[PDB]
Design an enzyme around this catalytic site. Sequence first.
Site, short mmCIF file in Angstrom:
data_model
loop_
_atom_site.label_atom_id
_atom_site.label_comp_id
_atom_site.label_asym_id
_atom_site.label_seq_id
_atom_site.Cartn_x
_atom_site.Cartn_y
_atom_site.Cartn_z
CB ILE A 32 -79.12 131.05 71.71
CG1 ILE A 32 -79.46 131.74 73.03
CG2 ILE A 32 -79.02 132.07 70.56
CD1 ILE A 32 -80.82 132.30 73.03
CE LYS A 33 -82.56 127.30 64.02
NZ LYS A 33 -83.29 126.13 63.49
#
Lengths: 276, 276, 276, 276, 276, 276, 276
Positions: free
Chosen positions: D188-189
């Site tokens: 996840i960013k």
Amino acid sequence: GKDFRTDQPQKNIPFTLKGCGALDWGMQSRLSRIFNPKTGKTVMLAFDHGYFQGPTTGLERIDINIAPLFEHADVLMCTRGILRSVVPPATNRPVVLRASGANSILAELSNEAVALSMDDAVRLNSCAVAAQVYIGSEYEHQSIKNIIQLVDAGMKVGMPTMAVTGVRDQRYFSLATRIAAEMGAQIIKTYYVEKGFERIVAGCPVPIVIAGGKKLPEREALEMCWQAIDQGASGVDMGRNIFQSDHPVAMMKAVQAVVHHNETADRAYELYLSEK
Amino acid sequence: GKDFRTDQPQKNIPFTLKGCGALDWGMQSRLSRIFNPKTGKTVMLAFDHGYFQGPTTGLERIDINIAPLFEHADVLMCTRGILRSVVPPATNRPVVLRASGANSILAELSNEAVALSMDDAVRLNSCAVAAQVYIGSEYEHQSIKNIIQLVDAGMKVGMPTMAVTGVRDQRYFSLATRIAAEMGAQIIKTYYVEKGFERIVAGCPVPIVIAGGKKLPEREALEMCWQAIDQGASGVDMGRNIFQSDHPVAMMKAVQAVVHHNETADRAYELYLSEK
Amino acid sequence: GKDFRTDQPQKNIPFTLKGCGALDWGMQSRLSRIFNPKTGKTVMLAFDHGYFQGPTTGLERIDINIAPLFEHADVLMCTRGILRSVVPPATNRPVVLRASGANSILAELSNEAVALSMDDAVRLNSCAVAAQVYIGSEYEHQSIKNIIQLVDAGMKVGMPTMAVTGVRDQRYFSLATRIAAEMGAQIIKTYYVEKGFERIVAGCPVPIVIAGGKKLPEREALEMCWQAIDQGASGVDMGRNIFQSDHPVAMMKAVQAVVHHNETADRAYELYLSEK
Amino acid sequence: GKDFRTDQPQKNIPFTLKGCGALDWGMQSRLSRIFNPKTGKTVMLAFDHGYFQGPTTGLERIDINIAPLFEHADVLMCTRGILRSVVPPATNRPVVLRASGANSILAELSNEAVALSMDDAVRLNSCAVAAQVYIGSEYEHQSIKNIIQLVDAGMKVGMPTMAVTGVRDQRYFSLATRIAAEMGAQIIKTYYVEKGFERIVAGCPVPIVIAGGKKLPEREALEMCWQAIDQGASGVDMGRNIFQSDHPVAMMKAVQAVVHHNETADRAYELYLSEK
Amino acid sequence: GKDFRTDQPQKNIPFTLKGCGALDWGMQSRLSRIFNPKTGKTVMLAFDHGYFQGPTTGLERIDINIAPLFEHADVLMCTRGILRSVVPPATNRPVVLRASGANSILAELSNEAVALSMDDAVRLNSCAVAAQVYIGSEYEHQSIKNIIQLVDAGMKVGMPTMAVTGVRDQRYFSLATRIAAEMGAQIIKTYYVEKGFERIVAGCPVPIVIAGGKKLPEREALEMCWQAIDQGASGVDMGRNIFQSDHPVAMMKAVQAVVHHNETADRAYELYLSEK
Amino acid sequence: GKDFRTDQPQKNIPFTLKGCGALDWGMQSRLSRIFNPKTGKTVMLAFDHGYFQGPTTGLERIDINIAPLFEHADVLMCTRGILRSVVPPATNRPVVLRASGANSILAELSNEAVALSMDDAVRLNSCAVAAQVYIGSEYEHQSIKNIIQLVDAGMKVGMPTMAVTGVRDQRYFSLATRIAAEMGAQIIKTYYVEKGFERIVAGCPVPIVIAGGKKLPEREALEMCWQAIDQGASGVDMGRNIFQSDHPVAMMKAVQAVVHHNETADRAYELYLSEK
Amino acid sequence: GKDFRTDQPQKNIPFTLKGCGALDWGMQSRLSRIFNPKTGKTVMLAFDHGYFQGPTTGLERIDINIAPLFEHADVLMCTRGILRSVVPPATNRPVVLRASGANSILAELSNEAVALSMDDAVRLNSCAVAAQVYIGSEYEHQSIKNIIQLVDAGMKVGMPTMAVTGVRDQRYFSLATRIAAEMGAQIIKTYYVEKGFERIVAGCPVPIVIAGGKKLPEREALEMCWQAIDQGASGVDMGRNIFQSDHPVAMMKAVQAVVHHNETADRAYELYLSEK
């Protein structure tokens, strides 16, 4: 010196699971993982709500909160994302993958799409794939199409499909369960109803499992379990009513008792307290 | 009112099964069905010999003779033909499908081909597929090609492959087991050896299961089991040594004891007699 | 307030790796993992011999013996079987998968088939796939077909193919390396030759890596390395000459020095002794 | 004269990267390229903004401005168009391909589609593919579908998927990150949050990397880095905060220090100044 | 001693079924199952309404109510869901699978999609697949596309397609039946019309079957049957008019008589009463 | 103010290349790249012999020896291996990829297999693919099968196929050329014959190109060229006779003259000497 | 003002071609192109011999010799190579593509393989594809497999398959024709037999066409034609007996007469001489 026992003729063992008498071996096998063959029932621990809800209460940390819970469940239900990351493979429990998604609590709830390919569900050794059907909602059409598509794929590969009815009275769930079952879903998951649940079960040609809904005091949840089973449900899934209880494991053994062993609600509750 | 337990950081549960630490969740799952996660071992009841042998002794009527035996096995191994016809889906036990065939006892033994598609193995909910490798035999090349092909297919789909070494000393089984493992097989099944079995296990990077071979007196078979396990085997398959014994179920509990619970050969044997 | 630097025109950085100037970005990338862009060379640690040989000496326990060796290698070479089981993913080193097999030391050596699908090579994040070509051997035709097929597949997907010449003079290796290269292999692995190695390199249009062959005293192996590099080889793989040395890591640093840093054989040997 | 080391039993090396313990070797391998196995973290240099923004400030000329920057990054993130044209393959750094697009700053931002096939991603030797998810935006449904589709494809092929949350408080990023992760994204960013970031990390079952956002004074960006890491982020991507700084390389070494080596913000800043 | 009967030349048996004279053997065969070759007609028992209606009256329990009815029907028509769960394979009657769906009685009726793959239709040994066309309704375009798509698939595989016209005078049904037929449907199912039914049949180049519509007093339904047949229909499906009658089996024999045997409405009715 | 020139009717330009009048545009286009439309002929520089021969004399270093030669050729013929490694894409000359191989000069010559997929030929922008046919040799069957297969593939994609006759009189080449052409090859490459070449050309329905064979004194090679063209050949390929001549470029101009411009052998030779 | 002609009921036109009464429209259509619907017969001009024979006598120049002949034939038979190169598409005559090959007159005659894909046959608008079966020859197995394969493919696509029996008495051709027919060939082509031809025809359930064989004096060929037709053949192919006659066109009109119009041999011959 060989014995073919010619005097004793080979006979076929019947498969009694409701409405699953005409399925290939693999499919019957998967179902048999989920529903105990002796009792024809299942206790399901479902924690897939993250899928449109984010870190719901009690599912904040599956890895810690829920991990201890697995052993006491017949079947687990989660997303493929969660499964790979925080459910240990060695957990050695059958899973029903949640395979719809693409909605948020921030938008229309019924706006779901198929959320993984059967390809990966097979890759993950699932016992079934599940999606939500939303009769009466805005995206009811896409929802059914979702089930359809899952069944088309499942059939190529021996994967049962579970349709969950998202939403409140009997006549209504009858419509929703029946359409789903009729489309091809082998398992229906739905809600309990104080009046007329029997008609719902009777009208559904395949096994029904009930979702718990909002958290209730255990005594009341157990009574609901007891009633659902008594009225012919094939399994219960208490989500919140389990992972949210202060004494989860105790609750499960309660539920195990009502479901598989027939304990009456009261006894059940008592070992509930017993197990704290 | 939500708790993310920030003070406690998510940690990964290791997967300890030998040489299976780098496998996708589904594959690890299927293997976990076969090999007990607690003990890391399996008791396998294999009845696939019909595949090139016809109604071998004691396999005359699987439906009668072996049907009672299923519940006491960790994992079953048979053909897809047999599985569909006379193994009840509700048997609810993991199966390793035998996937090589096309030989007879009337012709060259090593002349095997792949005997079912991964497609069907997946359809049948298998935990693994198995084929024979024949180092030193006339068709040794095809045999390895068979393994190769099964691994190529299994990897697409999360299905482990078991290579069985068909044939007599350690140096030999070392070559055979190792080549198979090296080609890609996740499980190796092979024979016990009185001298140097340790080298065989030590040199194989993945789990080893031993086949029983010809029927022996139980006391002797158990001793063999005990030895194999003591020397690092991850499971045993007593074929003949079980279905042929006059007291099969008793034998299995004997084997369960040696394998999972560590009983010494003697105690084992004793509950053997105990269970008659 | 934006600067496009119009006074300075974009210019293409040349890719200097021998014979790889016309490849797509991905393929050039994988090759760049293998051969250092600065020096245009690689130190390869190959332990794939189990593939037809079983537990060869020094490869008895890859997990213990060779595991410590990985960090000092530019690129690893092993089977997919060994890689999944006993090579830790975190090893973080580029691999060349050995993709031929189905031969034994018990039968004709040249009898090899393709041993895994590009599909799985891609799944395993390989930098390249390797197979053996056997000019002059009985199955020389199949061996080339194997290369061909690997190249057809690798081209769809950006996967370089390494052809290894299995077997003894220059004229011979020239024929073999050149045919392989010509068929389409991007990397050729072959043996060093005391007379005429230069012609071999000169005649090959793509990078050449040399295999070590039987174990030699280090001083001698290093000299061979030194000579091979001096004569235009792009890398060396000392198999036995490394994993079999009593002081492996020291050897590798020796090799690193000769290959990348240009040290003369003697100096190299000396830090060999230094590093014990 | 062979040693199998029977006294010493093969043991599995754990894979500690958060939520990536149940992945196949290849996928674990790609991830290990991105996140350093020793520190479990990554410094990411992302310059993909051209994708909907055109020649944004500081990205006017990747080939000149950013080219020098590559060597000091753990992983690069760009479009496949930029990668092929102006990133040298010899750059030898892992890339995460940006795989969503079809939006402009001239129209609705959330209107994104999948912008390259897994086929090409694999062709380009990517370590992962990335797309944006837009909870709350108009096209939030399509955005998730995009993630889903990339995961379906990536799972066939061993390619991890990164979901980036495009948009502002914790509760919100919790929902967005969690849904993406749950759908199946391995990385996840997201953005850093001054209050409650810990809950965001704690609730995400897979690695989180933070985006820098608008340019800040270095001292402040470092503190943000320091805080993100201190609060459990697995990597940071300072986009603007790097390529826009007057002293880029110095900044990166600053960030390297905070991230991998643990330097405190102040020391970090100081070598920042040191390196000018 | 062989006789080729040269004096007697092989002659082709005509296939007389209306508009089905140019079909491959398999397709002709499936149609021949449905429509009796001797009389060129069929008595169809359709219970597929659950598909958008849920447990409609009299279809509450197919397994109990309708199960007895099967033997007296030429062809059955239900969903794939119902078929697998509660229709016994041994029922040994040809089925026409209902293959459209995804609508509810809670939303626009004409909003249908293809509800199963030809793949599964073939897997279920169907004689035909059916979908609804809705001329004049809101989703009339999709409805025809549905038929198209089924015919495209059915032609690959020898599967006839039935188009049912969902909705009221002759000119109208002419349009609807004709378009469907023209698109490619081999069987048209439609409603009876008191004026001009002849034109409907005459204008359709393929067999027509009529649906019963709302329950009527038997005498009246029989008259309708009689009329439809007299006016050239090739079969009748009395749904409600059968499963809802207090004396179902009696009714069917009534219908059998009118359809296949030509009995006049009155006689028919009389044996109706006879069979109570 | 628009002019459709109605008084002047659109007319089709004939395609005169021999036997290629019934080909789709793409295929005619590729052939037009090879054979000059004005003169209907081609000068081919073939250097593919490395494919079974290794570094044959004069092909030791394509990159140096032959690279200068490209510009003076109408079409190049080499392996895909050589093409990618040492033929510059900017060479901007049409290529006929050699697509058979898997033989060595060390084994039976005729033992060839298809050496690259049409897939890759198309990926390389080829104008045609070539393979050898060996009438009368041991592997003549496989050789023709090769041609067949390439044609089957090429027809899907617009790729012409060249069949080369590997081996000595007219009647013979007539058989070989004609079978290949008949099988489907669009271009036939073969040897010149002192008696009866006319019959060979006349009997071939598609363009013929002649191979030079062993090196001759230029004067004699030119005369052969002149004779081949005079007798109806559509191109010549002087392999050895060019790359081996001491004055290659001069030779090619000689050949250009004879082929395209009609110069008589003598004049041709003279500018041969002229151009030294 | 519309007339549906209700008084007149639609009736199916029988398809009388022998053994072709159960084929789909497209297949019946292709056959109808070949065999005249009125007479149920065909005059075939076959010139495919080049396929294994090279430029046989009279086939030296199809373009000149045979081109004039097309218009007087019902159906042409040639290779795909020849068809594209020298048969004008405008020739507007149905073709039967010869689809077997890979043999030479220099090797075993029966060594044939499928010589083109159905894919191309369909691309060329064929009416049928033909291959040789060789009962009693060395490669008889492959030959039948060839037919099998073509029929498998043709059935997908509506393409009839012609099996030709390559080789001498009735009992023999009975076996050969019947096996081919039985395998699935829709047209059988075979040789005439002076004794017992009737049994051959009677025993074949599908149309039979006879090949002419070696050149005979016209009077004798005509008598053969006349006899074949009289004895129940559905067409004749006089190859040599036509293209080799000094007066080809005249011959064909002769044949037309015998075949379609029933002329007796003598009259036929006479207009033979008439037409010179």
